Amino acid sequence: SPAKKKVIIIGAGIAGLKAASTLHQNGIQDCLVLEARDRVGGRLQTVTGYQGRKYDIGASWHHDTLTNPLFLEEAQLSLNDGRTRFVFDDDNFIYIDEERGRVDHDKELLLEIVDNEMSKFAELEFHQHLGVSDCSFFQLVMKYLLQRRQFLTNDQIRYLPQLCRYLELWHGLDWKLLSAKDTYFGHQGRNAFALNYDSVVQRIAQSFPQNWLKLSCEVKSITREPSKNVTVNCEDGTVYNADYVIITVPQSVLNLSVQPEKNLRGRIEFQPPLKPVIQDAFDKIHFGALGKVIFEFEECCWSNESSKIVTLANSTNEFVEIVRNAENLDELDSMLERETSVTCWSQPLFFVNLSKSTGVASFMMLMQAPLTNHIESIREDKERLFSFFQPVLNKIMKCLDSEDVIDGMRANKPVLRNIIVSNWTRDPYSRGAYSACFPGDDPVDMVVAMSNGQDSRIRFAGEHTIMDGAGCAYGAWESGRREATRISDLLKLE
Amino acid sequence: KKKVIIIGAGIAGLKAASTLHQNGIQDCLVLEARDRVGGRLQTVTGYQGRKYDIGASWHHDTLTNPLFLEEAQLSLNDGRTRFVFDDDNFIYIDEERGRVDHDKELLLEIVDNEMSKFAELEFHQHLGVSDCSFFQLVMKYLLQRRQFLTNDQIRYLPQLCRYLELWHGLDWKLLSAKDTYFGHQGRNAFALNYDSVVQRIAQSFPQNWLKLSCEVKSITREPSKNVTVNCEDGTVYNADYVIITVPQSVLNLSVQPEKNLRGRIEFQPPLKPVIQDAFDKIHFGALGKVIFEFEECCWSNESSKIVTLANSTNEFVEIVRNAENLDELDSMLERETSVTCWSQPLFFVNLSKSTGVASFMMLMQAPLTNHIESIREDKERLFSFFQPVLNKIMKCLDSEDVIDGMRPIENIANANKPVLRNIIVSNWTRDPYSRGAYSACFPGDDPVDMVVAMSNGQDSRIRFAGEHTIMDGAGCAYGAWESGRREATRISDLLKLEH
Numbered sequence: 001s002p003a004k005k006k007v008i009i010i011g012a013g014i015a016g017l018k019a020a021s022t023l024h025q026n027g028i029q030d031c032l033v034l035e036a037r038d039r040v041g042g043r044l045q046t047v048t049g050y051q052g053r054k055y056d057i058g059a060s061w062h063h064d065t066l067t068n069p070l071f072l073e074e075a076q077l078s079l080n081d082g083r084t085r086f087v088f089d090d091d092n093f094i095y096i097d098e099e100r101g102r103v104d105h106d107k108e109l110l111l112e113i114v115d116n117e118m119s120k121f122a123e124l125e126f127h128q129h130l131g132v133s134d135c136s137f138f139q140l141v142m143k144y145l146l147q148r149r150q151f152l153t154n155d156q157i158r159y160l161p162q163l164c165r166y167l168e169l170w171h172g173l174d175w176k177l178l179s180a181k182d183t184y185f186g187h188q189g190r191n192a193f194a195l196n197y198d199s200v201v202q203r204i205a206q207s208f209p210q211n212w213l214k215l216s217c218e219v220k221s222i223t224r225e226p227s228k229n230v231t232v233n234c235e236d237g238t239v240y241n242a243d244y245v246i247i248t249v250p251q252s253v254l255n256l257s258v259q260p261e262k263n264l265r266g267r268i269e270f271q272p273p274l275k276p277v278i279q280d281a282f283d284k285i286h287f288g289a290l291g292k293v294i295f296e297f298e299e300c301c302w303s304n305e306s307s308k309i310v311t312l313a314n315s316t317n318e319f320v321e322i323v324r325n326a327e328n329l330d331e332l333d334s335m336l337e338r339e340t341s342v343t344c345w346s347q348p349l350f351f352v353n354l355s356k357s358t359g360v361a362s363f364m365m366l367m368q369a370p371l372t373n374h375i376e377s378i379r380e381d382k383e384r385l386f387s388f389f390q391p392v393l394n395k396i397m398k399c400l401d402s403e404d405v406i407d408g409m410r411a412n413k414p415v416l417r418n419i420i421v422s423n424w425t426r427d428p429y430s431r432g433a434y435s436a437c438f439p440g441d442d443p444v445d446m447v448v449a450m451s452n453g454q455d456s457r458i459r460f461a462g463e464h465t466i467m468d469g470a471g472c473a474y475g476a477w478e479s480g481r482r483e484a485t486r487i488s489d490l491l492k493l494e
Numbered sequence: 495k496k497k498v499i500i501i502g503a504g505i506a507g508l509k510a511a512s513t514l515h516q517n518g519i520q521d522c523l524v525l526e527a528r529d530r531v532g533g534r535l536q537t538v539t540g541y542q543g544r545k546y547d548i549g550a551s552w553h554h555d556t557l558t559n560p561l562f563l564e565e566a567q568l569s570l571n572d573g574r575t576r577f578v579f580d581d582d583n584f585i586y587i588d589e590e591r592g593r594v595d596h597d598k599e600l601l602l603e604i605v606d607n608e609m610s611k612f613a614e615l616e617f618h619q620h621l622g623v624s625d626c627s628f629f630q631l632v633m634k635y636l637l638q639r640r641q642f643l644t645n646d647q648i649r650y651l652p653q654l655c656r657y658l659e660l661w662h663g664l665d666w667k668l669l670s671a672k673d674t675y676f677g678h679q680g681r682n683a684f685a686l687n688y689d690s691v692v693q694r695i696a697q698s699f700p701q702n703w704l705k706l707s708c709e710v711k712s713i714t715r716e717p718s719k720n721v722t723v724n725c726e727d728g729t730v731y732n733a734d735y736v737i738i739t740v741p742q743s744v745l746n747l748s749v750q751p752e753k754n755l756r757g758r759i760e761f762q763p764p765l766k767p768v769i770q771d772a773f774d775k776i777h778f779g780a781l782g783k784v785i786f787e788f789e790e791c792c793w794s795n796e797s798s799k800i801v802t803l804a805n806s807t808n809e810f811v812e813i814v815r816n817a818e819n820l821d822e823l824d825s826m827l828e829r830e831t832s833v834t835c836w837s838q839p840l841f842f843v844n845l846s847k848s849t850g851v852a853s854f855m856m857l858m859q860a861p862l863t864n865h866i867e868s869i870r871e872d873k874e875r876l877f878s879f880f881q882p883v884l885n886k887i888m889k890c891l892d893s894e895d896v897i898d899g900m901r902p903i904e905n906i907a908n909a910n911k912p913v914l915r916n917i918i919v920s921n922w923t924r925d926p927y928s929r930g931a932y933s934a935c936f937p938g939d940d941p942v943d944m945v946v947a948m949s950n951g952q953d954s955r956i957r958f959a960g961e962h963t964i965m966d967g968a969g970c971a972y973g974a975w976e977s978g979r980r981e982a983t984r985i986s987d988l989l990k991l992e993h
């Protein structure tokens with residue numbers, strides 16, 4: 001009964017899609033790509049909004065364009081057909097405080113400058129020196145303020161910590177949940193806003209046999225018969241046999257495997273269960289929750305000075321006073337515990353003014369955990385969403401020379417037509433955005449256990465399974481290429 | 495006759511004396527060729543009593559700079575102001591285009607940042623695979639990334655990124671690519687009187703130790719147990735240990751012919767190969783300074799850091815687009831003079847915003863430096879040479895063209911126009927006791943070598959100190975300061991532990 005297959009890939013995200021592509025390109029046939037959703041792409045998904053406008057609600061950028069192999073590949077194509085597949089949209093950040101207004105490039109505040117000194121401080125804090133304890137990003141910032149208070153103005157002490165939190169939008173984590181050791185990292189060059197990551201997804205998906213793709217099939221278990229064979233079971237009853245399998249489900253979905261209860265959507269029952277090294281790696285790495293909100297307006301009636309805008313959370317002069325009077329990190333903690341609801345100003349938010357970079361009168365906004373989890377939970381209540389983001393949307397329009405926003409969801413004033421929201425934390429085949437470090441996490445344990453496979457036949461691919469480009473679309477891509485190559489060679493020696 | 499002999503009263507030599515004294519060492523003296531202390535640290539006085547550091551000006555790497563932290567503690571204790579954090583957002587000016595900084599369409603700072611990453615990736619974990627000139631490195635980048643750069647970015651980015659010339663005091667075709675990018679361990683603090691630092695240390699040991707105008711010309715280390723030193727005037731001192739702090743450039747004369755060169759010291763026996771071979775790894779740049787003193791501030795204090803970019807050409811762009819490789823671009827870059835204020839980048843510190851003084855402190859680099867210090871006394875010519883960039887700057891700062899008021903001919907209808915009252919220029923390249931600014935790398939150079947050679951010393955008795963004898967803070971005031979405490983400590987114990 002079990003139909004024979006050379007290789008069976010679980011998940012049609014970019015890792016799985018590139019693993020299949022690699023296999024076909026290497027002359028391997030009789031393979032399959034099992035995907036639980038009714039589409040390919042995984043965390044790469046482009047959606048349609050007001051008037052046919054398109055937005056990437058998952059990944060949006062090609063990072064590290066200096067080294068990024070996926071980007072380079074895409075750039076080569078565009079060098080021939082002259083087609084526009086991406087656009088370099090890095091720009092000078094505009095920072096907005098609710099009270100003070102724009103604080104970027106300010107001749108008195110000089111925030112970007114002290115931020116740079118802070119990064120250096122963090123680097124001098126962990127780089128080189130072995131054995132330093134980890135601690136949260138927030139605690140790292142307080143330590144910086146404490147040690148350098150003699151060289152900072154009251155305004156810098158107040159607004160710097162809030163401006164530094166834009167890093168929260170790189171991890172999808174609040175600074176008190178984020179590992180200080182993982183916060184900073186060098187970007188290998190400018191980023192490139194993909195103009196349809198779906199275009200990248202379809203190009204790869206289409207580079208191999210289409211009857212290889214099986215959508216809407218949710219894998220529920222994988223068994224290794226200690227006799228060169230692997231049994232896979234789709235929920236739709238079908239059973240398969242294969243020499244090899246490449247598992248590319250999110251680290252969060254795979255986690256479900258090391259816990260009791262098998263009736264969880266997306267969970268895969270492994271027999272034998274995943275090795276202890278893999279099991280144990282889950283206690284040393286976690287998952288962040290970066291989310292997106294697409295604010296679509298009728299037309300562009302605001303300044304297009306920049307395509308990057310960050311709204312700072314609220315700060316107070318009281319905080320400055322506490323920093324001035326604290327004797328040590330211990331007292332600052334005590335004094336800081338000063339005693340109410342969560343508003344659009346309770347945390348930083350990162351806005352992408354697509355008007356300037358793509359010409360579309362819309363804003364792409366990034367949010368972090370825990371806000372992401374609350375906002376996605378009420379993803380349906382548009383009225384409530386507008387109320388929540390109304391004050392910061394207004395403050396932006398002010399700073400960008402415009403009037404308060406008008407709710408046109410059902411000539412001189414910005415009219416909001418639609419609001420789109422990500423759903424990654426509530427989606428069972430997602431359960432979050434991507435791998436992230438809580439203080440104490442060592443991503444290396446997971447990368448090592450994943451790339452060494454459960455055994456010779458059961459392998460892993462995905463953004464959480466590799467070092468360079470970890471968490472990125474291109475890293476997931478490379479991992480796909482990594483596992484398919486190892487298998488092509490092995491089979492090649494058949 | 496003496497226990498320790500310190501040659502040079504720069505900050506390296508003065509710290510070394512301060513230390514020895516701090517460890518109760520007796521009978522030590524400081525021999526300085528000049529008629530003052532401070533070496534490359536010199537604060538001069540100009541119009542209306544304004545003071546300027548014509549040598550070192552900033553405390554670099556304030557996060558780790560131990561000299562700076564010491565000054566900071568002093569300030570915490572007495573409230574006296576010893577420095578100010580003058581880092582600021584740079585204003586970049588092009589003769590034709592005007593301001594090109596923080597531009598919504600040019601975004602030069604962002605690509606310059608990428609430019610920096612690329613440089614790290616090229617020399618990263620490769621053992622520094624064959625260095626080239628900063629200029630060459632920049633061309634590689636332009637070529638390899640042209641597909642992702644606009645025409646104007648290709649034109650102005652190379653010019654803007656040359657601000658790095660003012661950090662080395664070397665033009666981009668003479669500068670080592672591998673050493674072009676530095677750490678910058680935190681903000682910089684402008685010393686509000688480095689003379690305060692020099693004075694403090696000079697006053698921390700026996701005032702009778704110092705001997706000014708004493709040019710040392712020969713250091714003889716007899717296989718016995720004492721060293722012999724003789725100033726040019728004839729006086730000969732002999733001591734247990736000797737800490738030589740003269741600048742690398744001067745020390746590099748000991749390995750040349752003709753002991754008639756001013757400053758050159760004759761070693762007996764000669765400097766071992768290791769040391770002499772160290773000088774083969776280039777070194778010594780020529781950062782220079784010009785101070786423009788105005789009657790009063792009549793320009794906008796938008797920033798305290800202004801950089802005028804050297805002229806560029808669209809013709810250059812066209813060539814980057816065409817070249818098919820590094821060799822074709824290299825040769826396709828053949829344009830067949832005259833040096834003007836626009837032939838190189840110039841760095842202007844607008845002291846009005848940071849220190850409330852109506853002056854500009856301008857930094858220049860080799861080969862321009864030597865030419866400008868050559869005519870330092872020709873005020874009229876100095877004015878004509880920089881007049882165009884000065885006006886270009888004043889225009890951008892919402893002011894008028896400069897008026898020459900250096901002579902006793904003041905006017906009354908010039909209250910809205912900036913009035914230049916005086917110009918002050920350095921003389922480091924032409925001063926025999928400095929012969930340049932400080933250690934620097936020509937492509938192919940390797941500082942580690944001279945550092946180890948100097949650090950190791952000629953022997954347990956003939957030691958070295960100075961901004962070229964250390965790794966952390968190399969070429970900086972604090973590096974020289976530390977190197978001084980270093981040799982001091984060693985010699986200290988070798989004497990304290992004895993009897």
Ligand SMILES: Cc1cc2nc3c(=O)[nH]c(=O)nc-3n(C[C@H](O)[C@H](O)[C@H](O)COP(=O)(O)OP(=O)(O)OC[C@H]3O[C@@H](n4cnc5c(N)ncnc54)[C@H](O)[C@@H]3O)c2cc1C
Pocket residue numbers: 010011012013014015016034035036037040041042043044057058059060061062063217218219220248249250253265266267268290291292422424429430432433434461462463464471472473474476
């Ligand atoms: C909001 C957001 C923004 C992001 N922005 C960026 C960015 O700007 N740049 C960047 O580089 N990265 C970004 N990322 C990360 C990037 O999207 C991911 O690294 C990458 O898409 C992960 O790819 P993958 O192939 O490993 O996994 P997917 O996460 O691609 O997983 C593969 C597939 O497994 C399927 N699957 C799960 N369970 C089962 C099952 N039981 N049976 C069958 N199939 C199953 C899933 O449905 C999924 O399609 C972002 C992520 C999010 C969530």
Ligand SMILES: Cc1cc2nc3c(=O)[nH]c(=O)nc-3n(C[C@H](O)[C@H](O)[C@H](O)COP(=O)(O)OP(=O)(O)OC[C@H]3O[C@@H](n4cnc5c(N)ncnc54)[C@H](O)[C@@H]3O)c2cc1C
Pocket residue numbers: 501502503504505506507525526527528531532533534535548549550551552553554708709710711739740741744756757758759781782783920922927928930931932959960961962969970971972974
């Ligand atoms: C234009 C300029 C700008 C600078 N800006 C900065 C800055 O912003 N920040 C910073 O950290 N550094 C700066 N520096 C560098 C800083 O000035 C030096 O690192 C430091 O002063 C070197 O100190 P030193 O003690 O090693 O040498 P000096 O160079 O201090 O040398 C010591 C002494 O040796 C004496 N000497 C030489 N030959 C003989 C001889 N034969 N006999 C007796 N005595 C002799 C000299 O006259 C001199 O006084 C700058 C330098 C220049 C030229």
